[PDB]
């Protein structure tokens, strides 16, 4: 039967979307179907930031950040706990979850 109002993607007037490769896998997934992960991290986060802070020749030296973007296949997205499954009535919530941490 019909599961969602859309078809698991965002293609509405296109027909063909330029496929992309997965990160953990190598699946040829379409661009609007894959789950996109954009994580903002730095080089060291908690176990070495003070150890660098008293080992740097420049005082008040801010650590540079690392910016990567991840494309996930759906099986890789479920297997890596990126996205979960909800109930029938709770599926139609397009708002992102509150990023408290």
């Amino acid at each position: 039967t019909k599961k969602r109002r859309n078809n698991g993607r965002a293609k509405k007037g296109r027909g063909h979307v330029q496929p992309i490769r997965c990160t953990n896998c190598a699946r040829c997934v379409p661009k609007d179907k894959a789950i996109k992960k954009f994580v903002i991290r730095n080089i060291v986060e908690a176990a070495a930031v003070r150890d660098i802070s008293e080992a740097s020749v420049f005082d008040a030296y801010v650590l540079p950040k690392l910016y990567v973007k991840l494309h996930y296949c759906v099986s890789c997205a479920i297997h890596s706990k990126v996205v979960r499954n909800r109930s029938r009535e709770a599926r139609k919530d397009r708002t992102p979850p509150p990023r408290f941490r």
Binding site: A46, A47, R50, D51, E54
Partner: protein
Amino acid sequence: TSRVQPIKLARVTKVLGRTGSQGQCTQVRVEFMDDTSRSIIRNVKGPVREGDVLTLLESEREARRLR
């Protein structure tokens, strides 16, 4: 390390949840006597009151998960 560091005193302010795999460790908001401004989070072991004074060896690191 090969560095010397003086013993810095500490004081808890509010007890937090208990971390660890078996619930052995405890999170607590802990604060320094000689530096009233700064306050860090440290993992403690054993039963803690809501204002007892604490002895800490290193003031550089921060608390984390059970891992």
